[PDB]
Structure formats: C-alpha cells, structure tokens
Amino acid sequence: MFADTAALKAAMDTALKEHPDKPVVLDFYADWCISCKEMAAYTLNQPEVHQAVDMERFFQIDVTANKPEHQALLKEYGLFGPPGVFVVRSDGSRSEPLLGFVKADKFIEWYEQNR
C-alpha cells in the first residue's frame, strides 16, 4: 500500500521485470471508497483469491490526499477517481477496470480473463 506514486511505480516495474508474463494488479484506494471496504471484508481476504493473483503482486495506491501526483496517475489510467482495479501487464497494457464490489468468484473470473 503506497501513497507515493514514484515509489509505487518502481515497485510495480520491478515485479513486472522479474516475471514479465505474470501481471500485477493495481487498486486505486481512498479512505472513503465504499467498494474498497467491501472488497477488504468479503473478497480480497479469501484464500482462493490470494492463489490466483499472487497477493505479492497486488498493489494499492492511496489517493485520499488528492495530491497532483495522484491526479496524474488517475489520468494515466483514464479515471477521475476511485473506485478502480486494473490488471497491469508488463508490456504497458492494462485491463478494463473493476468499478465496484464483486464477489470472489467473479473477481477470479475477471483476473483469469485478463491474463
């Protein structure tokens, strides 16, 4: 969980460089994001979910402070603000976002579909 976008980028790129065919996942978090609270309580804490994603490759950027660096990263991903979860691949491409709460089964299905 990061609040510094450049630090996040370094960590993500290291993971992608060390294992390029395995993507990472980026969640745009805020203290006020309702779907983030629901995901934490019912979905992203499930062991089946941890196995498909590799939670060592699950990243969160906390944009609550709405700093300029956060606005820029949102723009890079085509968002105005949370919620948003992306599969981010080593070639620079990204999936369509998850835009709200989903249950474990659907979450795994979305991840597997987006390689």
Which lies closer to Zn ion via its Cβ, residue 64 or residue 71?
64
Q: What are phi and psi of 20, to 5 degrees?
A: -65, -30
Minimum separation from the CB atom of position 101 to Zn ion (A): 8
d(CA 25, CA 27): 7
Among candidates 94, 49, 91, which has minimal Cα distance to 74?
Answer: 94
Residues found near Zn ion in the complex (CB under 5 A): 4, 6, 21, 27, 31, 33, 35-36, 39, 62, 64, 69, 82-83
Minimum separation from the CB atom of position 97 to Zn ion (A): 10
Which lies closer to Zn ion via its Cβ, residue 21 or residue 91?
21
85-88 and 58-62 beta bridge pairing = unpaired
Minimum separation from the CB atom of position 90 to Zn ion (A): 10
Which lies closer to Zn ion via its Cβ, residue 6 or residue 113?
6
Which lies closer to Zn ion via its Cβ, residue 100 or residue 113?
100
Q: Per DSSP, what are the bridge partners of residue 88?
A: 24, 94
Residue for token pair 């369509």: 96
Minimum separation from the CB atom of position 110 to Zn ion (A): 13
Amino acid at 6: A
